[PDB]
């Protein structure tokens, strides 16, 4: 299923006037001007429930918006009202943007569903203490879970069969940018011979919970 991904139609804005006194953080800086647009598809259950949300930004300001549940453009700040009024008086263009929840959002999800949705990468679990010699206080037990996808994961520490729910220090879910995540869920504890600390990892690429004792 190697079909062609569709892009959203970028509408052309019109001239006319200016607005009085704009903002500008300043503090001495190079002048810059940015026209930026995010056409978002929000899937609540695949293509069953979908909502298109277009977001316009001029520099640091979000100024216009298109919520498919409205069906028209709506200014967020006054900088975007001219576009709202212009685009909204254009019937064809509206029927067109409205159609994009189907011609773009749904159409593309069916494509990505073949590979991005079902993507799974199993994690690598690794435990290990932290701090040289005695911590002169509680020591750190590190549960490293790296190289996984999707992000949904549960990593639980236990102490002698009991789940430790306090004393946890974590980086939280860390995104590497290459479609893999990682995370270190540490545990402030002083080691004690026959005593045991266990890390349990649950993730959709697994069939059964990964446990690692130390």
């Amino acid at each position: 299923g190697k079909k062609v991904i569709t892009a959203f139609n970028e509408g052309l804005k019109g001239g006319g006037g200016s607005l009085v006194g704009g903002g500008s953080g300043g503090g001495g800086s190079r002048p810059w001007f940015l026209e930026y647009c995010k056409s978002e598809c929000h899937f609540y259950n695949g293509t069953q429930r979908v909502r298109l949300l277009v977001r316009y930004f001029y520099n640091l300001e979000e100024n216009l918006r298109f919520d498919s549940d409205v069906g028209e453009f709506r200014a967020v700040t006054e900088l975007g009202r001219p576009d709202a009024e212009n685009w909204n008086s254009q019937p064809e263009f509206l029927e067109q943007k409205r159609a994009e929840v189907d011609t773009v959002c749904r159409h593309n999800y069916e494509i990505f569903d073949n590979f991005l949705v079902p993507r799974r990468v199993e994690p690598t679990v690794t435990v290990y203490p932290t701090k040289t010699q005695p911590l002169e206080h509680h020591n750190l037990l590190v549960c490293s879970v790296s190289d996984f996808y999707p992000g949904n994961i549960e990593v639980r520490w236990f102490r002698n069969g009991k789940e430790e729910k306090t004393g946890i220090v974590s980086t939280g879910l860390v995104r590497n940018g290459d479609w893999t995540f990682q995370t270190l869920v540490m545990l402030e504890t002083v080691p004690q011979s026959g005593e045991v600390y266990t890390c349990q990892v649950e993730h959709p690429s697994l069939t059964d919970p990964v446990t690692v004792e130390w």
């Binding site: 970028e10 052309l12 804005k13 019109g14 001239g15 006037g17 200016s18 607005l19 006194g21 704009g22 903002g23 500008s24 953080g25 300043g26 503090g27 800086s29 190079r30 002048p31 810059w32 001007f33 940015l34 026209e35 930026y36 647009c37 001029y58 520099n59 640091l60 300001e61 900088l79 001219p82 690598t124 790296s146 190289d147 860390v174 590497n176 893999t180 990682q182």
Partner: peptide, 30 residues
């Protein structure tokens, strides 16, 4: 986007804004 930017600069009377500085974190992959 190119065309619209000029329209936007006109409408805002070429009013700039601040440059927001980035946060930087160096970490290892594994």
């Amino acid at each position: 986007d190119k065309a619209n930017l000029d329209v936007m600069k006109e409408r805002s009377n070429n009013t700039p804004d601040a440059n927001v500085a980035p946060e930087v974190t160096v970490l290892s992959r594994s």
